Symmetry: C2
Subunit: 327 residues, 2 copies
């Protein structure tokens, strides 16, 4: 038996509840993990919110990111003592995740760590992984430094911040767009050449093709922002669409695509194929490592997690929270 921090719904509200629990509580899987570290994401905070729309059904241990050490394995790909990261698929949303001393997952959902420490794996986590996919996607369509600035929208969120870091470190001129002026310095510290406010700017008349400004973009916002970005991408550029704030509707035109050769590349880390996921983590370990992430990382003891979750939900938390569970 071990300690798990279980989310439970009673009379409409949702509460994180520290409880001792046995083996039979864990979901089904070939690989059991002593969870060293986890993270706090907006998605983890939504799992502890009434109408959050993230959890299929309670009760559930939240924590979409799981990083730690294999204690038991019924799979020949993983040995005891291997360090691993597991994220995406059902983890922390439809089955028990990282906010517990132990977790169990299929081997088909597990990534083996090499150089990278478990703490770093968790610090990067789903958010940084998604940023890395966005960078690969853009590069997969010919985007290279020195044909203009790369825009990152919703830049202060978890994906945006790592994107700025990765793109700047790969030699792109990054312009970060954020609706939170208090975050401009942090974004600059992460490599933004400039920081601007929300898009479109209030005065702007929307056109099918507006003034070409951006060589590429990483979009974390969707809606009218994305529609505006598409109208202002340069000939042959691309946009990696990673996120949604507001409704899902997108009202655009086909003109940037057919007249400007623009590409819109949808980024999904949840169901990304495991072979590719493992490959990408290797990059995260090496050439795609976020160099300046540590400088905004803060260690949060699992016991103090509700405090951070609340600030993340309120949108007032600064930096990246890596949750110390069992280290």
């Amino acid at each position: 038996e071990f300690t798990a921090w279980i989310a439970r719904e009673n009379e409409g509200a949702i509460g994180l509840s520290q409880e001792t629990v046995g083996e039979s509580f864990l979901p089904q899987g070939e690989v059991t993990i002593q969870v060293e570290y986890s993270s706090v994401n907006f998605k983890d905070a939504l799992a502890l919110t009434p109408k959050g729309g993230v959890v299929r059904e309670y009760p559930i241990v939240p924590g979409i990111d799981v990083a730690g050490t294999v204690v038991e394995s019924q799979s020949p790909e993983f040995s005891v003592g291997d360090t691993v990261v597991a994220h995406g698929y059902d983890i922390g949303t439809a089955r028990h995740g990282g906010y517990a001393q132990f977790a169990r997952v299929p081997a088909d959902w597990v990534v083996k760590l090499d150089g990278m420490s478990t703490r770093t794996a968790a610090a990067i986590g789903t958010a940084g992984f998604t940023a890395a996919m966005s960078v690969e996607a853009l590069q997969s369509r010919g985007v290279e430094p020195g044909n203009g600035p790369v825009l990152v929208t919703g830049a202060s969120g978890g994906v945006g911040t790592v994107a700025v870091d990765l793109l700047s470190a790969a030699g792109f001129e990054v312009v970060a767009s954020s609706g939170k002026p208090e975050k401009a310095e942090l974004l600059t510290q992460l490599g933004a050449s400039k920081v601007i406010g929300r898009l479109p700017e209030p005065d702007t008349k929307p056109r099918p093709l507006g003034k070409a400004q951006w060589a590429a973009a990483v979009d974390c916002v969707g809606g009218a922002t994305l529609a505006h970005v598409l109208s202002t991408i340069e000939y042959g550029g691309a946009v990696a669409a990673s996120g949604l704030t507001g409704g899902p509707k997108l009202e655009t035109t086909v003109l940037p695509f057919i007249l400007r050769g623009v590409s819109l590349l949808g980024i999904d880390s949840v169901q990304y194929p495991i072979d590719q996921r493992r490959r990408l983590w290797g990059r995260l370990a090496s050439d795609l490592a976020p160099s300046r992430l540590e400088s905004i990382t803060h260690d949060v003891p699992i016991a103090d997690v509700v405090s951070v979750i609340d600030q993340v939900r309120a949108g007032t938390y600064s930096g990246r929270a890596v949750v110390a569970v069992a280290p």
Copy 2:
């Protein structure tokens, strides 16, 4: 002096006029081509249509595709006797194009033919080139035969017919969507596994995420058709958008992108960089040669062109018209 077929605007009508002209009438450029073949596209019909929206100003020699022999060159890259194809940029829309015995173009807009004949290069033309671009775009995002059908919308048009041919020949299972049931046989002859009508079908409810039926698509329609296609692409699939039939507006959602990892890739043959254009014509000569295009190709003497333009404008023309400018 030589013969040109010139489109002139007269009291609201647009007619093609066979006229004797001299060198000074040719536009500026390093390469002079004795035109052997051109083609009829819907775009060329529109050039010869009152509110067609394709021609910058009249008078103009229409014909977006030019294939023939270099007879003069101020450029070291082209020699007298070289066979070439020239299409895109301003050709046949903002400067004199292929419906004339000679044409002149910058060297940077010219593709030198090796194996390929000028007849073949005209028969493929812009429409076939655009089909080949669409196939490359899909493959650039991982699309492969064997894990579901590929949709081709507006399939009976110039781009769609060549896309059916190329995709079926590469092993894909191609479903051809066509609003013209009389064309089903021709589409089957070019390799369509199945032929269906227009999309969406009247009895389908439009959703953000509809039934995942298509591994990928080549869309030549845009509008509500493209919105529907985007909502019905399977996880990780892609769409190559080349066309606009209706309005340019596109009302969609970000959900196929964000939740299903779908890509939308805009296809522009008009301004595509010459270096890439030249490489892709090498492929059309070899690994991407449309194997069944000759079976639907028809030679049309330049003198009889108006008859074919009128049928193409009406949507009543069967197959591909290659125009023999020079005897």
